[PDB]
Structure 1
Amino acid sequence: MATFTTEQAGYQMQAILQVIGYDLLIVVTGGTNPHIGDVTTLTASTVPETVKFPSHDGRFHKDNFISERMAKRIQRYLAGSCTITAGIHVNQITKAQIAAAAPMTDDLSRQIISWLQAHP
């Protein structure tokens, strides 16, 4: 249904939003290698819950800070269920990139909130 991008100092993240009835599905990725490392689910009135996927070396992917952050930002605007995937390869990128991805996620979230307000 809709694609958004955000950029901070050369690093780019993207969010693809799909409206499935009253329910939402959002894929958040970054850099040049799309991936799903974590999934966070929520409704307007329940606390978001995360499932982590295993990485190749056995560690769980820690990209859930992205999906949980977006979940917290958009929660009050949800008409139904919401499923958010995240994957920016936090196990491979620099600490500065990981830190920058938090305000970048806030920017994608506001872009999404605006789009939802314009397409209720």
Structure 2
Amino acid sequence: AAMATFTTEQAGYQMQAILQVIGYDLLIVVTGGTNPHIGDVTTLTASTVPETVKFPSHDGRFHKDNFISERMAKRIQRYLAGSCTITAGIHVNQITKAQIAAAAPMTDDLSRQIISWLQAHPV
């Protein structure tokens, strides 16, 4: 199983997804960088359009939005047996353009591990 942890690291920083199964429903906590937080929450089922809450900036200043919980939700949506809630909060102090670019492949890498896990542990 009811809990699993997935990690990836590209361009020198790590992202992590912690998955918890509750009933037929999923909770996925996505964090990364030096300052993990909860900046976005995406909710969905297999058959509804995902929706995303965006909290005010965890440190007040402006950071580019990489759409991480939305991107993960799109990848895993068709594998869901019930509801799904994805939090995301990645922060790298003085992030570089290459590290920004790595956010999308790293999210897909976590998504692929999650999908494999769900297929191995049907709920």
TM-score, length-scaled by structure 1? 0.89
Q: Distance in 2 between matches of 1:17 and 1:28?
A: 9
Kept in 2, the 8 Å contact 1:52–1:64? The answer is no
Kept in 2, the 8 Å contact 1:38–1:63? The answer is no
Q: Distance in 2 between matches of 1:64 and 1:79?
A: 27
> Which runs of 5 or more structure 2 residues have no equivalent in the other structure?
none
Q: Distance in 2 between matches of 1:75 and 1:56?
A: 27
Distance 1:60 1:24, change over 3 A: farther
The structure showing larger relative contact order (alpha-carbon pairs under 8 Å, at least 6 residues apart) is: 2
Q: Compute the displacement of 1:95 (Å).
A: 3.0
> Which runs of 5 or more structure 1 residues have no equivalent in the other structure?
none
Kept in 2, the 8 Å contact 1:37–1:53? The answer is yes
| Runs of 4+ displaced beyond 3 Å | 56-64
Q: Compute the displacement of 1:57 (Å).
A: 6.5
Local SS of the residue matching 1:109? helix
Q: Distance in 2 between matches of 1:88 and 1:103?
A: 14
Deviations 1:28-65 (A, max 9, x none): 11123221101001110111100000025657876560
Which has the higher mean CA deviation after the structures are superposed, 102-111 or 62-71? 62-71
TM-score, length-scaled by structure 2? 0.87
Q: Distance in 1 between matches of 2:33 and 2:92?
A: 11
CA RMSD for the aligned pairs?
Answer: 2.1
Count matched residues. 120
